[PDB]
C-alpha cells in the first residue's frame, strides 16, 4: 500500500494494541508489547519509508500525512533524527534547482520566497515548531542558495526595487512592510551582500532622481531594516544619499528666495539636485550642446552654490537629468516628461523637421551607444512621437526621423522617461566589476584593521575573523594574494618562524 495509508495502519495498530492492554491485558505488558510493535512497523523501516514516500509528500503538501509521520517517527530510536536528514536533503535538492539555472533567474526570487513559505508553514503545523527543524531548515537553506555565487544577492535587490517603484499593487502599508520583511528574512541567507548594496544603491539613485517611489516612509523602513542585522556602515552611504536630498531642497529654497528680488525673466522652472560624490554611485559625464537659455540657468545657479558654499566644485551630470516639454500638436497640447537626452533631440524639430541620425548626432552631441536607445524611444517602442523612415526594430545610420502628427492619446503629461530607469547590460557588468574590484581593498583594509587590534595572530585564526567582518566570501587564493601585498608594503610580517603566525609591525 502507499505510505500515507501505511502510516495510518500504524497509528491504528498502536491504538488497538493500546486499547487492548486496558481490556484483557496486564498493565505490565503494555510497555514490552508496544515497543515490539513500534520496532516492527517503524523501527526496521524508517529509511525505507522516507526513501519512498517523503519526497512525494512534501512537494505535494500532504499536511495531515506529514503530521502523522512526525508524531510516529518521533516515538522511535533515531526516527526524528532520520526524518531531519531527508527533509533537509530535500530542501536543498529542490532548493538548488531554483537558483542554479541562469535561464530561470526571472522567477528566481519569488519562487525562493514562496518555497520558504511552504517549508516554514510545514514546520509550524506538521512539526510542532520543533526547533531542531528550524535550525536545519535555516542552516540548509543557506547551503543551497549559496551554491550560486552572486546572482541571489543581485536579484533580491532588483526585486526589492520593483516593490518601491511607481505602482498600485503595493497599495497598502500593512502588507508592504510584510512583503518587505519576508524578503529580509531571505536576505540573511545570502553571501555577498556587498553585491546587494551594489545594485541596491544603483537602483535607489535612479529612483530618487527619476520618478517617484511607493512611499517615502516606506523607502525609509527598508534602510532602517538593513542597518539592523547588517551594519551601520553597510548602509552608511544610502543614508547619505537621502540627506543630500534634504539639503538640495533647503538650498533650492534659498536660490529661489534670492532669485526672487531680480524682477525675473526666466521662463524655465529649474530645480537642481546636488549630490555628494563619495556617497552616490560613479557617473560618467557626457558632453552635450545645451540650449543657450539652458546654460545660463545652470550658471547662475552654480555661482549661487559655489558662493555660500565655499571650497567646492560641481560637475553636472546630464545622464541623470530630465525635464518637462510642452508640445504643440493637432488635436492636443500635451506635455511630456522626458530625459535630457530626449529633450534635446526633440527640440531640433522646432526650427527644423525631418532629420537623419547623423545630422542629429552632430547637433546636440550624444553618443552612439545611447543616442540609439534614446532614439529607440520617441519612435520604435510604441511608435508615437517621432517616425523612423527606414522603419525597423533598431536604429541604423541613415534612418530619418519625422516629427509625427498623431496624438489620440487621452492624456496630458506622458512619460517617455522609461528609458532612464532600465539597466543596460553594460551598466550591469560595470556595476559588478566595481565590486569584485572593490572586495580587494575591503579585504586588505579589513586585514590591517584587525592586525592592529591584536598585534600577533595565527593565519587560520584570521581567515576566521574575516568571515565575520567582511560581507562576502574571500577566496583562499585571493587572501594569500593579500598578505603578500601587505608584507611587501610593511604592514605585517611572519615571525616566530612558522608561516601560520603573523605579527602586526607598525
Residues of the shown chain interacting with another protein in the complex, contacts defined by CB under 8 A: 209, 233, 236-237, 267-280, 282-283, 293-294, 297-298, 301, 311-317, 320-329, 335, 343, 346-347, 349-350, 403, 434, 437-438, 440-441, 444-445, 448, 452, 485, 488-489, 491, 506
Which residue, 87 or 280, has its beta carbon nearer to another protein?
A: 280
Residue 91, C-alpha cell as written in the block = 530542501
- C-alpha distances out from residue 309 to 29, 247, 303, 304, 315, Å: 92, 12, 10, 8, 15
Report d(CA 277, CA 141) in Å as an integer: 38
Report d(CA 257, CA 139) in Å as an integer: 59
Which residue, 148 or 471, has its beta carbon nearer to another protein?
A: 471
Which residue, 115 or 329, has its beta carbon nearer to another protein?
A: 329
Q: What is the nearest approach in angstroms of another protein to the Cβ of residue 48?
A: 57
DSSP code for 103: G
Which residue, 125 or 303, has its beta carbon nearer to another protein?
A: 303
Under DSSP, is residue 472 helix (H, G, I), strand (E, B) or coil? coil
Q: What is the nearest approach in angstroms of another protein to the Cβ of residue 316?
A: 5
Residue 456, C-alpha cell as written in the block = 600577533
Asked if 488 and 496 touch (Cβ cutoff 8 Å), the reply is no
Report d(CA 142, CA 139) in Å as an integer: 6
Which residue, 67 or 272, has its beta carbon nearer to another protein?
A: 272
Q: What is the nearest approach in angstroms of another protein to the Cβ of residue 193?
A: 16
Q: What is the nearest approach in angstroms of another protein to the Cβ of residue 80?
A: 49
Q: What is the nearest approach in angstroms of another protein to the Cβ of residue 361?
A: 20
Which residue, 115 or 305, has its beta carbon nearer to another protein?
A: 305
Q: What is the nearest approach in angstroms of another protein to the Cβ of residue 180?
A: 25
Position of cell 526571472?
Answer: 106
Which residue, 343 or 377, has its beta carbon nearer to another protein?
A: 343
Query: What b-and-e string marks burial along 108-138, b requiring 16 or more CB atoms within 10 Å of the CB?
Result: bbeebbebbeebeebbeebbeebeebeebbe
CA atoms within 13 A of residue 268's CA, in its CB half-sphere:
16
Q: What is the nearest approach in angstroms of another protein to the Cβ of residue 113?
A: 31
Amino acid at each position: 500500500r502507499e505510505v500515507p495509508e501505511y502510516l495510518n495502519h500504524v497509528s491504528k495498530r498502536l491504538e488497538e494494541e493500546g486499547d487492548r492492554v486496558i481490556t484483557y491485558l496486564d498493565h505490565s505488558t503494555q510497555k514490552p508489547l508496544i515497543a515490539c510493535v513500534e520496532k516492527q512497523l517503524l523501527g526496521e523501516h524508517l529509511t525505507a519509508i522516507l526513501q519512498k514516500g517523503l519526497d512525494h509528500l512534501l512537494d505535494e503538501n500532504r499536511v495531515p500525512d506529514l503530521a502523522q509521520m512526525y508524531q510516529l517517527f518521533s516515538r522511535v530510536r533515531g526516527g526524528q533524527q532520520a526524518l531531519l536528514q531527508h527533509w533537509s536533503e530535500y530542501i536543498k535538492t529542490f532548493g538548488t534547482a531554483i537558483v542554479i539555472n541562469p535561464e530561470k533567474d526571472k522567477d528566481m526570487v519569488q519562487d525562493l520566497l514562496d518555497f520558504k513559505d511552504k517549508v516554514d508553514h510545514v514546520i509550524e503545523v506538521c512539526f510542532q515548531k520543533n526547533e531542531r527543524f528550524v535550525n536545519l531548515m535555516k542552516e540548509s537553506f543557506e547551503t543551497f542558495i549559496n551554491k550560486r555565487p552572486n546572482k541571489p544577492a543581485e536579484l533580491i535587490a532588483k526585486h526589492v526595487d520593483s516593490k518601491l517603484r511607481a505602482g498600485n499593487k503595493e497599495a497598502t502599508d500593512e502588507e508592504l512592510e510584510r512583503t518587505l520583511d519576508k524578503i529580509m528574512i531571505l536576505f540573511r541567507f545570502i553571501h555577498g551582500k556587498d553585491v546587494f548594496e551594489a545594485f541596491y544603491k544603483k537602483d535607489l539613485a535612479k529612483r530618487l532622481l527619476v520618478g517617484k517611489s511607493a512611499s517615502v516612509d516606506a523607502e525609509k523602513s527598508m534602510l532602517s531594516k538593513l542597518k539592523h542585522e547588517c551594519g551601520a556602515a553597510f548602509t552608511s552611504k544610502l543614508e547619505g544619499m537621502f540627506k543630500d536630498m534634504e539639503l538640495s531642497k533647503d538650498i533650492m529654497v534659498h536660490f529661489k528666495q534670492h532669485m526672487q528680488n531680480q524682477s525675473d525673466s526666466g521662463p524655465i522652472d529649474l530645480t537642481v539636485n546636488i549630490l555628494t560624490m563619495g556617497y552616490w554611485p560613479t557617473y560618467t559625464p557626457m558632453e552635450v550642446h545645451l540650449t543657450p537659455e539652458m546654460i545660463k540657468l545652470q550658471e547662475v545657479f552654480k555661482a549661487f552654490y559655489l558662493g555660500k558654499h565655499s571650497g567646492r566644485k560641481l560637475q553636472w551630470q546630464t545622464t541623470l537629468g530630465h525635464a518637462v516639454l510642452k508640445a504643440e500638436f493637432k488635436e492636443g497640447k500635451k506635455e511630456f516628461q522626458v530625459s535630457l537626452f530626449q529633450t534635446l533631440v526633440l527640440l531640433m524639430f522646432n526650427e527644423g523637421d525631418g532629420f537623419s541620425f547623423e545630422e542629429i548626432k552632430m547637433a546636440t552631441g550624444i553618443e552612439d551607444s545611447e543616442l540609439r536607445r534614446t532614439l529607440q524611444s520617441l519612435a520604435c517602442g510604441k511608435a508615437r512621437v517621432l517616425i523612423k523612415s527606414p522603419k525597423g526594430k533598431e536604429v541604423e545610420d541613415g534612418d530619418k526621423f519625422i516629427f509625427n502628427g498623431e496624438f489620440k492619446h487621452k492624456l496630458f503629461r506622458i512619460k517617455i522617461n522609461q528609458i532612464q530607469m532600465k539597466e543596460t547590460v553594460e551598466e550591469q557588468v560595470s556595476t559588478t566589476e566595481r565590486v569584485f574590484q572593490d572586495r580587494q581593498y575591503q579585504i586588505d583594509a579589513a586585514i590591517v584593521r584587525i592586525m592592529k587590534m591584536r598585534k600577533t595572530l595565527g593565519h587560520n585564526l584570521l581567515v576566521s575573523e574575516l568571515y565575520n567582518q567582511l560581507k562576502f566570501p574571500v577566496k583562499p587564493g585571493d587572501l594569500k594574494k593579500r598578505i603578500e601585498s601587505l608584507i611587501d608594503r610593511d604592514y605585517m610580517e611572519r615571525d616566530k618562524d612558522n608561516p601560520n603566525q603573523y605579527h602586526y609591525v607598525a
